[PDB]
Amino acid sequence: GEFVRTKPHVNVGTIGHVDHGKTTLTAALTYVAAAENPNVEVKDYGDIDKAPEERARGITINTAHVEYETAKRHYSHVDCPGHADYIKNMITGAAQMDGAILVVSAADGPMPQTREHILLARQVGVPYIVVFMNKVDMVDDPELLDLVEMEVRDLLNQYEFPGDEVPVIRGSALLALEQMHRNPKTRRGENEWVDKIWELLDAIDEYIPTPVRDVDKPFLMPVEDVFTITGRGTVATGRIERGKVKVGDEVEIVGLAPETRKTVVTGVEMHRKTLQEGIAGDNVGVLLRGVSREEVERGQVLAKPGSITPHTKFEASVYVLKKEEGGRHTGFFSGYRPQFYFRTTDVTGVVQLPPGVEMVMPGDNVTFTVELIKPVALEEGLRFAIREGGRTVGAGVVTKILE
Numbered sequence: 001g002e003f004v005r006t007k008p009h010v011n012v013g014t015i016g017h018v019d020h021g022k023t024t025l026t027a028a029l030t031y032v033a034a035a036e037n038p039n040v041e042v043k044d045y046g047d048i049d050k051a052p053e054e055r056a057r058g059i060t061i062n063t064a065h066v067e068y069e070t071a072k073r074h075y076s077h078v079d080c081p082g083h084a085d086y087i088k089n090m091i092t093g094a095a096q097m098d099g100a101i102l103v104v105s106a107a108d109g110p111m112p113q114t115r116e117h118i119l120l121a122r123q124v125g126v127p128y129i130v131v132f133m134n135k136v137d138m139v140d141d142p143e144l145l146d147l148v149e150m151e152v153r154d155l156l157n158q159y160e161f162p163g164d165e166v167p168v169i170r171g172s173a174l175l176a177l178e179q180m181h182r183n184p185k186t187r188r189g190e191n192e193w194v195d196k197i198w199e200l201l202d203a204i205d206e207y208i209p210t211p212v213r214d215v216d217k218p219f220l221m222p223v224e225d226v227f228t229i230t231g232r233g234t235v236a237t238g239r240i241e242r243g244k245v246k247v248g249d250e251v252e253i254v255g256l257a258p259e260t261r262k263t264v265v266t267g268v269e270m271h272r273k274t275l276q277e278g279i280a281g282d283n284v285g286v287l288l289r290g291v292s293r294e295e296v297e298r299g300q301v302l303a304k305p306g307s308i309t310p311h312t313k314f315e316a317s318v319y320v321l322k323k324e325e326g327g328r329h330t331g332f333f334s335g336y337r338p339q340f341y342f343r344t345t346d347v348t349g350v351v352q353l354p355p356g357v358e359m360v361m362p363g364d365n366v367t368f369t370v371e372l373i374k375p376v377a378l379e380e381g382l383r384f385a386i387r388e389g390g391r392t393v394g395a396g397v398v399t400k401i402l403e
């Protein structure tokens with residue numbers, strides 16, 4: 001059908017260590033919110049972890065986007081994988097969030113991807129975090145619960161989140177989800193577990209602010225994914241960063257290719273509902289005429305033509321992680337070629353250290369230049385993560401664009 005705007009729109013999502021309950025919580029949110037609002041369509045566990053490879057491996061691999069709303073706001077929710085091998089997908093998901101829900105298992109406490117997701121969330125600009133302490137149905141001991149909360153708050157403090165202030169909601173994603181399956185009409189106040197999900201919804205409503213967005217600046221949408229719709233054509237998905245897009249607009253596909261390509265937008269949808277106009281903050285699919293899925297990819301940006309010049313060379317201020325933060329034990333030299341993550345973009349780059357700086361060590365704050373092997377939409381003040389060999393090794397911010 002058609003998308004009707006009645007409420008402010010905010011993008012949230014789920015992050016946290018593997019198996020702590022992100023997807024189960026995402027499902028419970030749709031069911032719980034749907035009882036109050038009939039515009040919410042429910043999403044089961046298997047509707048979210050739907051890919052054959054997810055069924056095969058028993059984990060989330062792809063980000064999934066689901067929709068729900070409260071009385072206050074409309075939400076698009078990006079559910080990210082927790083497995084260490086799918087961090088790149090999680091980063092692309094977090095790059096779309098105005099706030100993240102950090103899921104931590106009460107039975108396990110914070111674990112290495114609890115830390116890594118918090119760190120990475122910051123580096124793609126997630127401005128606020130709410131915590132859901134999950135699986136409390138498995139933990140009798142009140143003292144362990146208090147310890148887990150304390151550990152999570154302190155961990156958040158380590159990455160410059162206000163850990164002492166974030167809401168920490170204690171519940172069971174699974175028992176809420178079970179109650180909603182048995183009674184899909186279960187309303188607030190009727191059930192203990194469902195009410196914890198309402199506590200989460202209230203915290204999301206009130207603690208994660210609606211961002212200040214600019215719809216007057218040139219259209220810019222980082223591409224998070226691309227697929228072929230049988231019948232329609234190639235669709236590029238993403239959160240619109242600024243400006244607006246309408247069907248009929250010419251856009252440029254910028255980055256990751258030798259040259260920029262122009263095409264015409266032939267459709268705009270949010271959660272499979274047609275948008276008259278996509279605006280900053282919307283989580284959309286943009287149908288692109290005359291390009292295949294081999295001609296658009298994650299990490300490119302769609303932009304008002306001529307508004308963005310992609311770049312390959314920049315100076316950066318970089319913090320290199322210590323080993324206890326999951327970084328490398330050893331340093332690196334000029335010529336080090338790790339991966340750089342900017343918003344939804346993942347690209348290999350060459351580190352070139354100043355003359356006289358021959359080695360950078362874990363724990364170092366340092367400045368150097370990077371040469372990307374492919375051009376990428378970049379700008380001064382843009383935060384990024386550095387990863388190599390399947391581990392996060394650094395966090396940086398672009399200081400100067402050289403080329």
Ligand SMILES: Nc1nc2c(ncn2[C@@H]2O[C@H](COP(=O)(O)OP(=O)(O)NP(=O)(O)O)[C@@H](O)[C@H]2O)c(=O)[nH]1
Pocket residue numbers: 016017018019020021022023024025058059060080081082083134135136137138171172173174175
């Ligand atoms: N006891 C209990 N088990 C739960 C709860 N929530 C989830 N689980 C169980 O925990 C396991 C993982 O749940 P899942 O939602 O897939 O976690 P995830 O964080 O999405 N995993 P991934 O990191 O791969 O995406 C499942 O076996 C699920 O049934 C809960 O509140 N209580």
Ligand SMILES: [Cl-]
Pocket residue numbers: 235267268269285286287
């Ligand atoms: Cl579309």
Ligand SMILES: [Mg+2]
Pocket residue numbers: 021022023024059060080081082
């Ligand atoms: Mg999952």
Ligand SMILES: [N+]
Pocket residue numbers: 048049050054060061062063064
């Ligand atoms: N998924």
